Design a protein around this ligand. Structure first.
Ligand SMILES: Cc1cc2c3c(c1C)C(C)(C)C[C@@H](S(=O)(=O)O)N3c1c([nH]c(=O)[nH]c1=O)N2C[C@H](O)[C@H](O)[C@H](O)COP(=O)(O)O
Ligand SMILES: Cc1cc2c3c(c1C)C(C)(C)C[C@@H](S(=O)(=O)O)N3c1c([nH]c(=O)[nH]c1=O)N2C[C@H](O)[C@H](O)[C@H](O)COP(=O)(O)O
Ligand SMILES: [Mn+2]
Ligand SMILES: [Mn+2]
Ligand code: NA
Ligand code: NA
Lengths: 469, 459
């Protein structure tokens, strides 16, 4: 049973984890370093010498698809396709696979409570210059509602506002938020217990961010990814269970009606979002391991680690698109398109006008892609994940006015300020497929194909040629 | 059980008329059937076709009722439950093989059968209710489809399957996997209604239309091995034609009047060579015609839309109703009513219609409305269009989309545009005006007048 440290050791063995011994500030500096590293496809980062703290800071954990896959015990990303197929069937009784509860766990080696609680001792990162305060970004928030037993895990950003106070920024459709809302109705004025785990094992982390239905515990999903039940421990001050191997656990509650102005904070869109009110999480206990490590990240102008995560987790929907449109070879939402705003789709085209049906399919078939503003459709000789192929296709297979489709007055994310009216805007599709007779009267270009015999011969003498050494 | 049992049921209920007067299969039957269909009349059995001894049955499914009866049910609204069944599709019933008596060889002569000529400029007599049975080389599934078949000789028919059909794909794959070998084919005329309906229902290519007929019937489809090949045809069929397609043999087909109300121009299709004809003793010939709608195929197509509504609703639960008027050539215009939940919703629904199911890929007009509209009444639909739309704001046009190659109205063969009319109530963001509150009646007044209606005695 691999905890997070076992994963960091695996990564280090494979040249996927760099230990930084230089002093680095959690205020802004770590983010800068992580950002350059992620943008160059570099390793995960463990800052052993954060300025002003003793607890090392881990970030960029999942900055690469490979490391996401490794985090689920795999070579590559396509086990997520199988999850997609699973989650489909429900709309398999031993997917009610529970947690395995230990009594006593490494995450409760050191315990501090009441007035000794001081979040300022933890190297919480400040990500961007106009961010309001340090921000906890990789907390697994654990909650129960009053009506079912299911424990939800979500990642909700948490602003520091005091020695023992965080703001809990769950958006209103989240498990945590719905649990709190129901607790309030069902028990007026009673405190809502909540717990937050930092640095759990990778399967739990990945399970938290898999979009499983509200009816199911994310702990059960982590179990399927791992191959074994998730190891947990009861919290000290409530009946919630947190992962046993967690590096740090925050326990506490939400006082009903206590709220605070949250932000502004830079988000995955690359802009600051404006101040808004969210509940206050009061921290009564902090439990941690000996030699605890603090797991953090940042969100900002993409790509960032959440966006790389989000790409790997989109594999969950590709098979559902392919059941419906088997012509679709690949379907990719670049991180640098804020994760959902641009799609590149490659097809085996079968008739004139095919690309238009596919665009309309993307914009209608699933709710996950209904708000996608740009859709580029290409043939299967294009790698959707390489802008060198996609731009090549766009610039050699399109006449812009002929091959661009615009639809006005369509549903758009209310937070997208670039549309003319909140909730309503246009969409564009680019048909960059080879044009067939009927679509063009010209003699279409024959692409240059290499001689496989020459390719193989050069493979054979490549090392001996010694061009590099 | 078989077709004859169905005819007897219909006759008992005043839904089948026997015509004893002499009537020519050249044009006359079509005229009689067309009038009958247009007035919602019964199915028709012509016992005295001029120049033949074999009775001619047509307008079998000329009414929605008779389509329902043909699947054992009492009502057209049972077809929704069939749709719920046709849904079962994610992941993680065979034939019963056993009659038809007499048989031919070199004295195969299709001219002895009362094949109909439907319209005055049609090229030749045409077989219109043949269940064509095929296997491909790669799977075992037997496809059943209805493909019009022109008479060109004592023993030769043209096989007009369009290129996306099961039969056509099977032949195309057979050619390629077995160059120059004959493609066995069989056509059954007058099978039991469930099999017939199963054949026209668009089930996925992966599934034998025999399996689906089994679900409609409640029991496995009874079938028999053909004499000259390994295909199986329904045991109760009135006539069976067996033979093959010689690779590369093609003939000019048509012109023929179509379900669009126009003549298709001449075009080339494979030749089906008939080596055997098998039939029952007092065989009945099942035929129909297509033309300007409504016709029997269009009535079929309306009943089979009820099957699709649930499949559309599973995917788009905002859809309350979904209707393809027969007058739109059955597939070219759709009216969809929704419970609108956000600004711009209609657009998602239009794109869904144009992308979700293949039968609607060529639908050139889509009108979307709110749920206070009855999609089946032009009075409501036009009222919605003319009171809830600004044409330029609320009309969506998409160019260069797939279109039926026979649709001569598109600017280029196979490619044309589509139009969606958003006739929903416009929400803030879509309009800055004060939207109209519709006039609702007082249900107390309505009920009070219902109560004194008879006493008022206006009629
Ligand atoms: C992986 C991740 C995810 C999330 C977040 C972040 C990360 C790293 C951080 C903390 C960096 C930043 C924000 S942000 O992406 O919204 O900019 N954060 C976040 C937030 N969901 C949310 O409601 N508030 C949040 O604050 N999300 C999404 C959320 O956790 C996710 O959608 C879960 O699947 C929700 O689980 P449920 O509540 O549906 O069970
Ligand atoms: C009920 C019916 C249907 C059909 C047809 C006819 C009838 C009575 C007739 C022979 C009267 C008229 C033509 S027509 O509507 O295209 O003019 N006919 C027909 C044709 N499908 C086809 O490819 N060629 C055809 O010739 N169709 C449609 C096709 O049979 C039907 O859509 C099947 O579900 C398709 O079979 P699969 O390939 O899906 O297995
Ligand atoms: Mn959840
Ligand atoms: Mn079929
Ligand atoms: Na979750
Ligand atoms: Na069929």
């Amino acid at each position: 049973y691999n905890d997070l440290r076992d994963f960091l050791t695996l990564l280090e063995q494979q040249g996927e984890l760099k230990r930084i011994t230089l002093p680095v500030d959690p205020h802004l500096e770590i983010t800068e370093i992580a950002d350059r590293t992620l943008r160059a496809g570099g390793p995960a980062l463990l800052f052993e010498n954060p300025k002003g703290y003793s607890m090392p800071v881990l970030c960029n954990l999942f900055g690469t698809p490979k490391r996401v896959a490794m985090g689920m015990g795999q070579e590559d990303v396509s086990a997520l396709r199988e999850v997609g197929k699973l989650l489909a069937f429900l709309k398999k009784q031993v997917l009610n696979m529970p947690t395995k509860r230990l009594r006593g766990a490494p995450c409760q080696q050191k315990i501090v409570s009441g007035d000794d609680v001081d979040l300022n001792r933890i190297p919480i990162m400040t990500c961007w210059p106009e961010d309001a305060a340090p921000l906890i970004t990789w907390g697994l928030t654990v909650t129960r509602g009053p009506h079912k037993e299911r424990q939800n895990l979500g990642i909700y950003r948490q602003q520091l506002i005091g020695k023992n106070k965080l703001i809990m920024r769950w958006l209103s459709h989240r498990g945590g938020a719905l649990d709190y809302q129901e607790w309030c109705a069902a028990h007026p004025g009673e405190r809502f217990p909540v717990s937050v785990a930092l640095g759990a094992d990778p399967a739990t982390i990945l399970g938290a961010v898999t979009p499983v239905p509200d009816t199911l515990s994310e702990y059960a999903f982590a179990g399927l990814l791992r191959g074994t039940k998730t190891e947990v421990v009861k919290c000290i001050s409530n009946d919630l269970e947190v992962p046993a191997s967690a590096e740090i656990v925050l326990e506490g509650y939400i006082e009903q009606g206590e709220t605070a102005p949250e932000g502004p904070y830079g988000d995955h869109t690359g802009y600051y979002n404006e101040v808004d009110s969210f509940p206050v999480f009061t921290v009564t206990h902090i439990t941690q391991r000996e030699d605890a490590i603090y797991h953090s990240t940042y969100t900002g102008r993409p790509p960032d680690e959440p966006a790389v995560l989000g790409v790997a987790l989109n594999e969950v929907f590709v098979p559902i698109l392919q059941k419906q449109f088997p012509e679709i070879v690949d379907f990719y939402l670049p991180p640098e398109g804020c994760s959902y705003r641009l799609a590149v789709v490659t097809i085996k085209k079968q008739y004139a006008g095919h690309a238009k049906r596919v665009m309309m399919g993307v914009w209608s078939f699933l709710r996950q892609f209904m708000y996608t503003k740009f859709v580029i459709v290409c043939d299967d000789d294009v790698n959707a994940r390489d802008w060198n192929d996609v731009i090549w296709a766009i610039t050699t297979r399109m006449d812009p006015a002929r091959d661009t489709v615009l639809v006005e007055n369509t549903p758009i994310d209310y937070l997208d300020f670039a549309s003319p009216v909140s909730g309503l805007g246009s969409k564009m599709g680019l048909d960059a497929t080879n044009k067939w007779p009927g679509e063009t009267q010209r003699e279409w270009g024959r692409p240059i194909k290499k001689d496989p015999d020459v390719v193989a011969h050069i493979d054979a003498i490549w090392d001996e040629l010694a061009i590099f050494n």
